[PDB]
UniProtKB/Swiss-Prot annotation, chain B:
A Gene Ontology term for the protein's cellular component: extracellular exosome
Binding site residues for NAD(+): 12-17, 37, 42, 90-94, 131-133, 166, 277-280, 347
Organism encoding this protein: Homo sapiens (Human)
Modes of activity regulation: UDP-alpha-D-xylose (UDX) acts as a feedback inhibitor. It binds at the same site as the substrate, but functions as allosteric inhibitor by triggering a conformation change that disrupts the active hexameric ring structure and gives rise to an inactive, horseshoe-shaped hexamer.
Family, as annotated: Belongs to the UDP-glucose/GDP-mannose dehydrogenase family.
Protein name: UDP-glucose 6-dehydrogenase
Gene name of this polypeptide: UGDH
Expression tissues: Detected in heart, placenta, liver, pancreas, spleen, thymus, prostate, ovary, small intestine and colon. Widely expressed.
C-alpha cells in the first residue's frame, strides 16, 4: 500500500550523491532532495564541476537535476517534506578513547537522528545508507523512542551500499544485489516493501534481498572482510611462492578455476588499500572483542596482520637489496593512488612503503599520473605538522617518471597504472646508478623480465622467487 | 608435439588412482592403462563385481573397458617396465611421530615408488605425481632419479594433482573445472607436459588444461583446499557473531554470496568441516610455512583450523550448558556421523569430535547414521572401556531419541527433516532440546516450538 | 502471613540436612519433619544410638524429638508427596571430568531431586535449596519444574543456605549470626519466603532473618566463604613478609585486628586453610566469573587459592632446605593430620599436602593424630594398595613413637596436646640437628626453652 514520493538524503558525499542521483534518474515521479551542512559541496553539486569524480555521474545528474533531483543546504524542510529520509553521513573511526583506531564514532549518525525527530511528524521511513557499525539502527531507534510525539511513526531500515571507486554508476544501475534490512514486524515489513518498490523501478525483484536489520548491517562489513581476506590469502601465498619457486600468478589461476572459489580478487599486490577494507575489518574485530568473541576477533585480525606483513616485507626486500642502507639514496616511487585509474590515496600501500623508506633516510621521488602533489605531501606528513621536516628533506614530487628515475638506485612500482609497462626502460637504465633495481609491487611488468634483465636490471616482483 | 603416450602405469589403486586411471582408459581407447598395487585383496576387488571404492558411475566406467585397455594387477615391476607414463598415486599420510608430528607429510611411499621406478626402468619415461603431496615432493623424486642414474635412462618428473570430491569423483573427472599439470621450464620438461596434455585433450577442452611449473602445481592443490576451508571457517565465524547479535547466518551468507566477486558456493555454516583433505592439507601448508621461516603466513592459515576447532567446541559447550553443565548418564541422540551427507566416510567428521566432547562429560550417546557402518563408529570413538560404557549404535533414529534429553544433528542427511518430531517429543525427557548443527531444520522452528522443543541452531540467536 | 508450613521433607540426610532438620523439629514441635535419603545404611544410623555424623549436642537434639515429630526414612516418594516444604540437601560435588573440571559444580543430584519432586507432587509446595549450590542452581530447578508442569501444580523455589562449621553445627543452628532466605520478588515468591521465615521465627529473632532475591542468596554463601578464606590468605601473606623482615605475624595480626572495622577473627596465620568448604567454594566462584566473562574478578579471587598453595609449598620447602635439600630415607614426624583441631575430618587438610611434598622427597613419614582414623590417612595419601604409601608412610599410635629417631617434627594441626609434650624426652632420641617446624604457632612462648634443650625451632611468621 505505502508509496514513497519524496526522498531526503542527509549527506551529499561519495555514497549519498551518486546513489540518490541514480534513484532520481530511474524514478522520475519521485522528488529527491540531497542535503548537506557543507554549503561549498552543495554548490558544487549545483555546478558544472561535480565535487565527486565518477564516470557517468555528470550525465546522470544533468539528466534530472532541477526536475526531480535537488541539492540544498535546507536540511530541515527536506526532512519535513520527506516520506523516506536516507542517512548517508560518514562514521569515522574514533581517534581517541575507548576503541581508538577501530571502533566507529556514531556522532554524526546520532546528530542526524536527533535532527530528524526534531523536524518530523507523521509517518516516515528512515534508512541507514552509508556504512555503519552493527547496532547503529538500534541506536537510532533508541533516540526516536526516547523523543516521541503524538502521531509520530518513524521506521528504521538498513540499506547498505556497494559502490567501488571508479565504478559507482555501473554498481548502482546494475548491482549484483540490493540489500535492505528491517524488523520482522508488520510495520517493519511495510517499510521494507516501500523501499523495495523504489528499487524495483530498475532492479529485478530477484536481485533485491530483504533481511533483518542486524543481518543487513553485518553483511556489509562481512562482505568487505571476505573480499579483503581473498587478497590477504593470495598475498600470503605470494610469500610462499618466493620461498619455493612456485609463481603466484600460476597458483592464483589454478585456484581461481575452481568455480566454488571463483577467479576474482586473486591478484597479489603489495597490499590492499582504500577507505573501506581496513576500516571495516578493524570495526568487525572490535565488534567481536566487545561481544566476548575473541576467537572470531583473532580470526579476522589476520586479514589486517597479513596486509601489514605484505607491505613490510616488500619494504624490507628493497632495503636489504640496497645493502640495508638507504640514507640519501634516490628512489623512484611509481604510483601513489590506492589502485589504478583514481586519484584517491586513502590507505594506499604507497603511503606505507614510502614511510618505511623515509624512516631509512631515502630521497623519494614520487610520480603518479592523477594524485595531486598536495595530497602526497599531506599523506606523508606528520599529523598536525603544516611544514613537516622529514617530507621537506626527503620527498620530491616528480612531474614525470623519467625525472623520478634519473640517478635512482631503485624503481618501486606500488600502483598498477597501465602506463608503467609502456615506459622506455632502456632509457631509464642508462641514467640509474648501478646496480639498478626494479621492485614490482603489482605484477605489472610480468612477461618483460627477460627483456629487463638483458638491459641490466635486477627485476624482482611479489610472488616470484629471486 | 612429437611424443605420444601409449602405455600408462598407475602405482596405487586407491581412491585417486583407480577412478582417475579408469576414466583415462574409458576416454582413450588406444592407450593401455595398467593400475597396480601391493595390496592383492584390493586388486582382486577391482577385478570383481564389487569395487573396493564406492563412487556413482564408477562401476559402469570400469566395466566398459576393463579387460580391453584397462587392467588391474599386482605385477608392479612389469607395468613400470612397459610404461611410457608412470603415475605415482600413493598416500602421503601425516607423520605420527618425530619432527613435524601431526602436520608434516610422510614421504616414505613416494620415495619407495621412486626407487622402484628407477630400478625397473630404462629409456624414456614420464613420471607424474597424481596424489596429494607436500610442496618439494617432485624435487625429492628428482633427487632419487639423479642419484640412481643409468646410461640412456631419461625420466621426466611432472605434477598432476587430483580434484576429486567424495561422491562426485566421476563427474569431477569427466567434466573438471580444470586439469592442472606442472613441469620444468626446460625443453624436455615442456615436451613431457605437452605429452600429458595430449592425453587429457581426448576429453577435456584445451582451455581447461592449465600448465604451470612443478612448484606452482603442488602448491595450488594445497592452496585451493585452504581457500575452500577458509570460506567455511569464515562463514562459521560469522555464525557466532549472528548468535551474539540477532543477525542470521543464512541471511548473511546469501547477502555475501550474491556479490559475484565472492560467489555463492561454500558458504553453508556448519558444526565444522571434515573429510580426509582439508585439515590434513591446511596443517601441511602451515608446516611448510614454519619450515621456510614464514611464521606470519603460518599463523594466517592456522586460523582456518583454530576456527573450525572453536566452532565444534562451542557447539558442544552449548549442548552441555543447556543441560545444566551435567551430562553424566544422560541419554543423547547423535543424528549423523558421516563427515557430510550421502557417504559412509567418517574421516575427520565433526560428529566424532562432538561425540568425544559429550563422552568426556559421561553422556550416554545413541548414534544413528543411515550409511556409516557400526564397526567404524566404534573404531572412531575408541582410544588408539569408554565406548563400551557410553556408546550405543542405534538401528533407527526413533530408538536413538527414545528417552533422550537432546537430539544433536551433526550431518545434513535429508531424512532428518522428515522425521516425526511429535512422536519423538512424546518419549523424550523434558525439557527436550534439538541442536541443529547443519541448519537442516530451517523453516520448521515455529512448528517444533509449538510441539514443545527448545530448538537451537548455529548462526541463530536463542 | 497466611500460608503455614506443617510438614517438611528434607531430601539428603547428610552433614547439612540431618542436623539442620533435626534442630527445626526440636524447635517446632507442631511441624512434622521427615528426612529422607537413598542411602539405607545412613538412614538406619540416624535411627540408631550411634549417629552417622558426630557433632556436639546433636545426639541430644535428635533423641528429644525422633519418633515424635522427627523421622528418618528411605521412603522418599511419600515424604515429598505429603510435604508443604521440601528441602533439597544433596551434595553438589566438583566435576571430576569435562568442562570446568576441578572447579565447576556438578548439578546431577540437584537435578535428579528436582525431577523426582515434580514427579511426586501435586498442588502447592515450597522447594528450598539448603546445601551449597553454584549460582544459577535455582534457575535450573525452576526450568525443570516449568518444563514438567501439571494442572494445579504450583511449586515455589527458594534458596536457604546453611552456615555450619565442623564442630559447632548445633550452636550455629540454635544461635546463628543470621538466617538467609532468597526468593523471587513476585507476590507468590514473597509468600513462600514469609512462610519459611515463620518456621525460623520459632527460635531466631526476626532481626536476624535476612531476606533477599534468590541470586543474592546463592552468591552470598560462596562470597562469605571467599571473604573468610581471604582473611586467612591475607594474614598468611603477611607471615611471609614477617619472616623476611623481623616483624612477627602474631604481633601484626593483633595490631590489625584491634581496628574494629577489620575485626579480630580469622587472623590466625597457618600452614594453610583446609576443609570441604573454602577451596571448593572459592574455585566455584572463580569458575562462575570466567563463565560470565569477568576475568578480572576471576583473577582477583584466584589469589586466595594461589596464596594458600604458596603458603603450603614454602613451608614444605623450608623443611626440605633445612635438611640439606635431601630427605630420602629420613624419618620425619608429622604431628596433626586433621584440617583443624578437635575433629577427625581431613578433607583438603594442609597435612595432606605437606606430607605429599615430603613423600616426593622420599621421606619416611611417621604420622600421629589423636582423632583421625589410620585408614583415612592411608586413603588420603594414596594415588587415586599404593606403593609410595607402603614404602614411605607409617601411622604412629603415639607422638613419641613418631619422633623416635626423627630428624624433624612437623606440626600441621593445632591440637592442644602438642604444646604439652615432653620435648626434652623427644630431643634425646632425635637425630641431630633436631628441628621443629611449627605450622600453627602452637609453640609460641616456648622458643627459648626449646632452643636451650637444643632444637632448631622455626614457625610461620617469625624470622629465623
Ligand atoms: C566500499 O565499502 C567499497 O570497498 C571496495 O571498493 P574499493 O573502492 O575499496 O575498491 P576495490 O575493492 O576494487 O579495491 C580495494 C583495494 O583492494 C586491492 N585489490 C583488489 C583486488 C585484487 O585482486 N587485489 C587487490 O590488491 C585494490 O588494489 C585496492 O587497494 C569494494 O570492492 C566495494 O564493493 C565496496 O562497496
Ligand atoms: C580432497 O583433496 C578433496 O577435498 C574436498 O572434498 P571433500 O570430500 O572433502 O568434500 P567436500 O568438499 O564437499 O566436503 C568437505 C567438508 O566441508 C563441509 N562443508 C562444505 C561446504 C560448506 O559450505 N560447508 C561445509 O561445512 C562438508 O560438510 C564436508 O564436511 C574438495 O571438495 C575436493 O576439491 C578435494 O579434491
Ligand atoms: C562450610 O561452608 C563451612 O566452612 C567453614 O567451616 P569449616 O568447617 O571450614 O571450619 P573453619 O571455617 O573454622 O576452619 C576452616 C579452615 O581455616 C583454617 N583457619 C581458620 C581461621 C584462621 O584464623 N586461620 C586458619 O588457618 C582452619 O584451620 C581450617 O583449616 C565456615 O567457617 C562455615 O561458616 C561454613 O559454613
Ligand atoms: O553531520 C554531518 C556530517 C557529515 N555530513 C556530510 O556527509 C558527507 C559524507 O561524505 P563522505 O565523506 O564521502 O562519506 P560517505 O559518502 O559515507 O563515503 C565514504 O565511505 C564509503 C563506504 O561507506 C567509501 O566508499 C567512500 O570512498 C568514503 O568517502 C560529507 O559531504 C559531509 O559534509 C553532513 O552533511 N552532516
Ligand atoms: O608400492 C606401493 C604400491 C601401492 N601402494 C598403494 O597405494 C594405494 C593408495 O590408495 P589410497 O590410500 O586410497 O590413497 P589416495 O588415493 O591417495 O587417497 C587418499 O588421499 C586422498 C587425497 O589425495 C583422499 O581423497 C582419499 O580419501 C585418501 O584415501 C594403496 O592401495 C596402497 O596399497 C603403496 O602404498 N605402495
Ligand atoms: O540423589 C541423591 C544424592 C545424594 N543423596 C544423599 O544426600 C546426602 C548428601 O549429603 P552430604 O554428602 O553430606 O552433602 P551436604 O549435606 O551438602 O554436605 C557437604 O557440603 C557441605 C558444604 O555446604 C560441607 O559442610 C560438608 O562437610 C559436606 O559433606 C548423602 O547422604 C547422599 O546419599 C540423596 O538423597 N539423593
Amino acid at each position: 500500500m505505502f508509496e514513497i514520493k519524496k526522498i531526503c538524503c542527509i549527506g551529499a558525499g561519495y555514497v549519498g550523491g551518486p546513489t540518490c542521483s541514480v534513484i532520481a534518474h530511474m524514478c522520475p515521479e519521485i522528488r529527491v532532495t540531497v542535503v548537506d551542512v557543507n554549503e561549498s559541496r552543495i554548490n558544487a553539486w549545483n555546478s558544472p564541476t561535480l565535487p565527486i569524480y565518477e564516470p557517468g555521474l555528470k550525465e546522470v545528474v544533468e539528466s534530472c537535476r532541477g526536475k526531480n533531483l535537488f541539492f540544498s543546504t535546507n536540511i530541515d524542510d527536506a526532512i519535513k517534506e520527506a516520506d523516506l529520509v536516507f542517512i548517508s553521513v560518514n562514521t569515522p573511526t574514533k581517534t581517541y578513547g575507548m576503541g581508538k583506531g577501530r571502533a566507529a564514532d556514531l556522532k554524526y549518525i546520532e546528530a542526524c537522528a536527533r535532527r530528524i525527530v526534531q523536524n518530523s511528524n507523521g509517518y516516515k521511513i528512515v534508512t541507514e545508507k552509508s556504512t555503519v557499525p552493527v547496532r547503529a539502527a538500534e541506536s537510532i531507534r533508541r533516540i526516536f523512542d526516547a523523543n516521541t510525539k503524538p502521531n509520530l511513526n518513524l521506521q528504521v531500515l538498513s540499506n547498505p551500499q556497494f559502490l567501488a571507486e571508479g565504478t559507482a554508476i555501473k554498481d548502482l544501475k546494475n548491482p549484483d544485489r540490493v540489500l535492505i534490512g528491517g524488523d520482522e514486524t508488520p510495520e517493519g515489513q511495510r517499510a521494507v516493501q516501500a523501499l523495495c518498490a523504489v528499487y524495483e523501478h530498475w532492479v529485478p525483484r530477484e536481485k533485491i534481498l530483504t533481511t533483518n536489520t542486524w543481518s543487513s548491517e553485518l553483511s556489509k562489513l562481512a562482505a568487505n572482510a571476505f573480499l579483503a581476506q581473498r587478497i590477504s590469502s593470495i598475498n600470503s601465498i605470494s610469500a610462499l611462492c618466493e620461498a619455493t619457486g612456485a609463481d603466484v600468478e600460476e597458483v592464483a589461476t589454478a585456484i581461481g578455476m575452481d568455480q566454488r572459489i571463483g577467479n576474482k580478487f586473486l591478484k597479489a599486490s603489495v597490499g590492499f588499500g582504500g577507505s573501506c577494507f581496513q576500516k571495516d575489518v578493524l570495526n568487525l574485530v572490535y565488534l567481536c572483542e566487545a561481544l566476548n568473541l575473541p576467537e572470531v576477533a583473532r580470526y579476522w585480525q589476520q586479514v589486517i596482520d597479513m596486509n601489514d606483513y605484505q607491505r613490510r616485507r616488500f619494504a624490507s626486500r628493497i632495503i636489504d637489496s640496497l645493502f640495508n642502507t638507504v640514507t640519501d639514496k634516490k628512489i623512484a616511487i611509481l604510483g601513489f593512488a590506492f589502485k589504478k585509474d583514481t586519484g584517491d590515496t586513502r590507505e594506499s600501500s604507497s603511503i606505507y612503503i614510502s614511510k618505511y623508506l623515509m624512516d631509512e633516510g631515502a630521497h623519494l621521488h614520487i610520480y603518479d599520473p592523477k594524485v595531486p602533489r598536495e595530497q602526497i605531501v599531506v599523506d606523508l606528513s606528520h599529523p598536525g605538522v603544516s611544514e613537516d621536516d622529514q617530507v621537506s628533506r626527503l620527498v620530491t614530487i616528480s612531474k614525470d617518471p623519467y625525472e623520478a628515475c634519473d640517478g635512482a638506485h631503485a624503481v618501486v612500482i606500488c600502483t598498477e597504472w597501465d602506463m608503467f609497462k609502456e615506459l622506455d626502460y632502456e632509457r631509464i637504465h642508462k641514467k640509474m646508478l648501478k646496480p639498478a633495481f626494479i621492485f614490482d609491487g603489482r605484477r605489472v611488468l610480468d612477461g618483460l623480465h627477460n627483456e629487463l634483465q638483458t638491459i641490466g636490471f635486477q627485476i624482482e616482483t611479489i610472488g616470484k622467487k629471486v
